[PDB]
Design a protein around this ligand. Structure first.
Ligand SMILES: Cc1cc2c(cc1C)N(C[C@H](O)[C@H](O)[C@H](O)COP(=O)(O)OP(=O)(O)OC[C@H]1O[C@@H](n3cnc4c(N)ncnc43)[C@H](O)[C@@H]1O)c1[nH]c(=O)[nH]c(=O)c1N2
Length: 460
DNA sequence: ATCGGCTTCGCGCA
DNA sequence: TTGCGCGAAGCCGA
């Protein structure tokens, strides 16, 4: 039994006789999952087993092997984890609107549950699934602490507007997780080949170095529920105490390193928050970190949920479009094309340094993300093209890419969504400016450049 | 209300 | 480096 404001009736309906079916999507984990926890609870009152069903869409050919393997190795571990609680896992392979709604038929499912994403394509799928199922259809926010549609019913203009609203809801929703009770009813293709198949598809596209070896180094983030925990734990032990004072230094590995895990659902951020809240470190440090994993993460959901064009110019706030529109004819000092950005071929060795961190590691430092996308706007031929170029490089190369945090962060950087207006520059209007020189007062830039020094020539 | 306060940007200056 | 103030800037919301 759990908080019901975590649930939303999609298709009002009458209960079916068969298994309760969890259509997993965003939250790829067995522990700390309110979606799976609710489907087990309604599975228990109907005395049916609960099964999980995952769909593998052809969206993987938009990304690279790095994302596809991180997740495929992640699913492979969950699969063993679900089986131990007697919950079988089914892996469909196609377009969900057709595939889920015909799984529901072939399987006589009693009722249907999914997790919550604000991305446009998921909602498109749901309404397809809804039109073609008889059984009721339930939705659970397992990704935010406070449910997106409960935190605030409108678009939030800034962190300080949303921050009260979220924090007066924290006592009621920041609670611990119960246990996933294993199935008691035991019930009636393979992830190996699907990985081999998908890798073969993506190989022609891999990002190589001149010497025909790949760029991406797969050893900075082991994928999986197990590996994620040892990251959250090492963070609370080694880094959190100094997080607030070094969050902004791209030479200190002092971030949480959590975002590939949170993105794929491999760890609950509600578990993190519990574990930070009880953990005993710098009060300033906890407050800075909680503002990121709580306020900034869950507002980025608030962004895409209430702004369908979250990845377009029209989503920017009224003043910001006015400013960029005023400066559309200004002569840019430089203009680069996508693949020149991609290949680290700017005049700015600090900018190429971080492009190099993105290519080789799959995670750009969070301070260097704000700079990277501001310099794209400043050296691209138009607002729209900057956006386009930045999303394409983010989602193609970030492990945490294709995520509401990506868009709301790109919108923040380029269009100022969730930000204020600043002193008026040429080209970038009133958009918050960051300078190379700003980064020199904050951290030894020569060390950052030095680290990824000798990848540009080695991968030209 | 109508005036403070805002992811803490950048750069002077000590 | 590293705080601390000051400048330029639009608007939510109490
Ligand atoms: C241009 C640009 C591009 C991106 C992003 C921001 C910007 C400015 N972000 C957000 C942020 O850069 C990223 O979430 C963290 O750096 C991920 O690293 P850590 O988890 O180590 O962060 P860290 O430990 O500092 O923070 C912990 C968590 O806080 C959240 N968080 C931090 N900064 C945030 C931000 N500005 N917006 C939203 N949530 C935030 C994340 O969930 C993050 O994992 C993003 N994030 C992401 O998950 N996927 C993406 O594709 C992108 N892309």
């Amino acid at each position: 039994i759990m908080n019901p404001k975590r649930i939303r009736a999609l298709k009002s309906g009458k209960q079916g006789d068969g298994p309760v079916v969890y259509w997993m999507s965003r939250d790829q984990r067995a522990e700390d999952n309110w979606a799976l926890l609710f489907s087990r609870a309604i599975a228990k009152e109907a005395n049916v087993p609960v099964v999980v069903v995952f769909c593998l869409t052809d969206e993987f050919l938009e990304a690279g092997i790095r994302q596809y393997e991180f997740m495929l190795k992640g699913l492979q571990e969950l699969e063993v984890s679900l089986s131990r609680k007697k919950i079988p896992s089914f892996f469909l392979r196609g377009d969900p609107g057709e595939k889920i709604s015909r799984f529901v038929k072939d399987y006589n499912a009693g009722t249907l549950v999914t997790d919550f994403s604000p991305l446009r394509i998921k909602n498109q799928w749901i309404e397809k699934v809804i039109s073609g199922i008889s059984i009721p259809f339930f939705e659970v926010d397992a990704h935010n602490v406070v449910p997106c549609w409960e935190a605030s019913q409108k678009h939030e203009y800034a962190a300080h507007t949303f921050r009260p609203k979220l924090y007066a809801l924290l006592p009621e929703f920041l609670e611990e997780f119960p246990e996933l009770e294993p199935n008691s009813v035991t019930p009636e293709e393979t992830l190996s080949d699907v990985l081999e198949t998908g890798v073969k598809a993506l190989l022609p596209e891999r990002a190589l170095l001149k010497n025909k070896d790949p760029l991406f180094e797969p050893w900075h983030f082991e994928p999986g529920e197990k590996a994620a925990k040892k990251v959250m734990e090492s963070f609370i032990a080694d880094r959190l105490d100094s997080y607030g004072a070094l969050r902004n230094d791209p030479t200190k590995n002092m971030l949480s390193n959590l975002s590939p895990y949170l993105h794929f659902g491999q760890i609950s951020s509600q578990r993190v928050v519990l574990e930070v809240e009880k953990a005993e470190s710098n009060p300033g440090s906890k407050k800075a970190f909680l503002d990121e994993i709580l306020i900034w993460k869950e507002i980025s959901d608030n962004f895409c949920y209430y702004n369908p064009g979250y990845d377009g110019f029209e989503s920017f706030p009224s003043w910001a479009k006015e400013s960029l529109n005023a400066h559309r004819n200004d002569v840019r000092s430089h203009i680069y094309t996508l693949e020149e950005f991609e290949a680290g071929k700017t005049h700015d060795p600090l900018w190429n340094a971080s492009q190099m961190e993105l290519l080789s590691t799959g995670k750009m430092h969070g301070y260097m993300r704000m700079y990277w996308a501001k310099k794209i706007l400043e050296w691209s031929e138009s607002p729209e093209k900057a956006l386009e170029i930045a999303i394409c490089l983010n989602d193609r190369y970030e492990l945490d890419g294709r995520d509401p945090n990506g868009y709301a962060g790109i919108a923040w950087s380029i269009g100022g969504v969730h930000d204020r207006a600043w002193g008026e520059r040429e080209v970038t209007g009133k958009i918050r400016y960051m300078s190379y020189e700003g980064c020199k007062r904050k951290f030894d830039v020569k060390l950052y450049i030095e680290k990824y020094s000798a990848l540009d020539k080695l991968a030209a």
